[PDB]
């Protein structure tokens, strides 16, 4: 299950980076730090809280229209 968390963290960081998030240094530093801790984690529960913390960054802005992208 953790391997899925690592893969989704990778793709999440890629989409965040192409959303032009590195224009603000502190935000990019926090994101890369969280991503590195997710990739190096050995157990699933802390991976998931760092995962939700990382996803909240994507949810914060308005660039990713969510209702359309959630088409089920």
């Amino acid at each position: 299950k953790m391997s899925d968390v690592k893969c989704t963290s990778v793709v999440l960081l890629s989409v965040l980076q192409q959303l032009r998030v590195e224009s603000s240094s502190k935000l990019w530093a926090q994101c890369v730090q969280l991503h590195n801790d997710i990739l190096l984690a050995k157990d699933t529960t802390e991976a998931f809280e760092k995962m939700v913390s990382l996803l909240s960054v994507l949810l914060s802005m308005q660039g990713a229209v969510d209702i359309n992208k959630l088409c089920e």
């Binding site: 299950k1 391997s3 690592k6 893969c7 990778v10 793709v11 960081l13 890629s14 980076q17 590195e22 240094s25 990019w28 530093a29 994101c31 890369v32 730090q33 991503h35 590195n36 990739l39 190096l40």
Partner: protein, 527 residues
């Protein structure tokens, strides 16, 4: 100032779905993802250039170096070297960068092109009477890794490597085209080369025991004296082609270009204190000279520092006495005793070297009495000479020779049955193969149909796992085979759907069968 980040690698989902289809990545399995594409924040380059703070001005025991250098010299008397003209240099990949500030106008092809075969020789003869400081750029690598530390590589300017190639190339290409020596640069592991290497280092020692190591941050913990000595040992062969002033000015140019050159890290010049720059012409051989120097120094320390009243074999005691005599009570080289000691070493300390990744087969009933270097002696030498503490979680020691080195060049060794006899093959870490399969740079994969050859190569490198007793290992190769099969017979159908004839003849069936791959590990060379 400019801040450079490191991006994360992309995801190849289709291969991951195929892997989970075949019952992979299940919890509690041995194979698991560990090699990822890490990311780095804004100030990643300078936070890695700052590691040169581990370089301290060091003094060397001169009356012992003046003997270790003789023995290391004798280790390199099998090859040839000399200056070569402009019309004989051999250069691969002429479209690489030309350093700073030359990368503002074109790649190395332009500067290797505009100079006629007389301008290059005019320059190479100019540098033998002058000193040319240069500016080195510093760049980060973008590759899979198992540790989150970045990697920084130095792009030296063209005016340095252009002349260093002419100066050193004859010896460099004579080292890489020799088989059976101590240095094993250029010997391939395919077609039964690894087995030949391993049977080379087992040569005639009596009660062997393997021993290996690697150096923590080898390029930055390098003292300046050992770099100088390595360059001197490399340039020694020019006894006839050059004068004595010419050799000194070439050495001064080397020290001005790869030892204290003004590194241009970021957007501003700094001063590199010391240590090798890893992106110059002769790094991979200077490191070999370093490694042999440390081995000889460890042997010298281990033999001198023994209570010479308990030693029972008379010959080694006389060796001790003469060793001290020619070390400290003498001033000039004694080639008779240098030959004597080199014979003693190569009879009781066999070696295999690449650029700082070594393997040593030593007689053990001597090392247990301190007549040759043990693995603590390298700790002591690295401590008082390299200013690094050698952790015993990086040096291994093996005693059952039927299994080869625990690790060499990042490949484990296994003894299988190949035909009628038994061979040694290098098998990689399976997680490395899977991580190369899944994480890629956006078109180089994530659509397998476009490449296919990368999967062919990866299945070539992942073959020796097919003989592994651990069942979860061979399924990696079998999965790779089935993925190549799926890719091929999906590309054919997709092209047929977009066209109206299918590929008339391919003979591609060899790619998804083991017979094409088992031929790369048998002792009969089809290049």
């Amino acid at each position: 100032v400019a801040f450079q980040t490191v991006k994360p690698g992309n995801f190849n989902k289709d291969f991951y779905d195929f892997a989970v289809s075949k019952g992979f990545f299940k919890e509690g399995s041995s194979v698991e993802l560990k090699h990822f594409f890490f990311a780095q924040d804004g100030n990643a380059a300078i936070s890695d250039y700052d590691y040169y703070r581990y370089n301290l001005p060091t003094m060397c025991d001169i009356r012992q170096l003046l003997f270790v250098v003789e023995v290391v010299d004798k280790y390199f008397d099998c090859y040839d070297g000399g200056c070569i003209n402009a019309n004989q240099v051999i250069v691969n990949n002429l479209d690489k960068s030309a350093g700073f500030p030359f990368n503002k106008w074109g790649k190395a092809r332009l500067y290797y092109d505009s100079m006629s075969y007389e301008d290059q020789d005019a320059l190479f003869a100019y540098t033998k009477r002058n000193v040319i400081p240069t500016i080195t750029q510093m760049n980060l690598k973008y590759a899979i890794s198992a540790k989150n530390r970045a990697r920084t590589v130095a792009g030296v300017s063209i005016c340095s490597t252009m002349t260093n190639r002419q100066f050193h190339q004859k010896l460099l290409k004579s080292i890489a085209a020799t088989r059976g020596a101590t240095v094993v640069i250029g010997t391939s592991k395919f077609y039964g080369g690894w087995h030949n290497m391993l049977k080379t280092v087992y040569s005639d020692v009596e009660n062997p025991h393997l021993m290996g190591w690697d150096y923590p941050k080898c390029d930055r913990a390098m003292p300046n004296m050992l770099r100088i000595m390595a360059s001197l040992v490399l340039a020694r062969k020019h006894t006839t082609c050059c004068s004595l002033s010419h050799r000194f000015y070439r050495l001064a140019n080397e020290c001005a270009q790869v030892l204290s050159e003004m590194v241009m890290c970021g957007g501003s010049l700094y001063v590199k204190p010391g240590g090798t720059s890893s992106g110059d012409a002769t790094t991979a051989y200077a490191n070999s000279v370093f490694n042999i120097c440390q081995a000889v120094t460890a042997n010298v320390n281990a033999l001198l520092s023994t209570d010479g009243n308990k030693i029972a074999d008379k010959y080694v005691r006389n060796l001790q006495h003469r060793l001290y005599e020619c070390l400290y009570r003498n001033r000039d080289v004694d080639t008779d005793f240098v030959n004597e000691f080199y014979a003693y070493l190569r009879k009781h300390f066999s070696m295999m070297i690449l650029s700082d990744d070594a393997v040593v087969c030593f007689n053990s009933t001597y090392a247990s009495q301190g007549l040759v270097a043990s693995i603590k002696n390298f700790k002591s030498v690295l401590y008082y000479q390299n200013n690094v503490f050698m952790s015993e979680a990086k040096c291994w020691t093996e005693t059952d020779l039927t299994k080869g080195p625990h690790e060499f060049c990042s490949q484990h060794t296994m003894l299988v049955k190949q035909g009628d006899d038994y061979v040694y093959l290098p098998y990689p870490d399976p997680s490395r193969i899977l991580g190369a399969g899944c994480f890629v740079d956006d078109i180089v994969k994530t659509d397998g149909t476009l490449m296919i050859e990368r999967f062919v190569s990866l299945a070539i490198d992942a073959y020796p796992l097919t003989k592994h007793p651990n069942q979860e290992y061979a399924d990696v190769f079998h999965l790779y085979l089935q993925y190549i099969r799926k890719l091929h017979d999906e590309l054919t159908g997709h092209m047929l759907d977009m066209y109206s004839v299918m590929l008339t003849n391919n003979n591609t069936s060899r790619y998804w069968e083991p017979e094409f791959y088992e031929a790369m590990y048998t002792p009969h060379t089809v290049l």
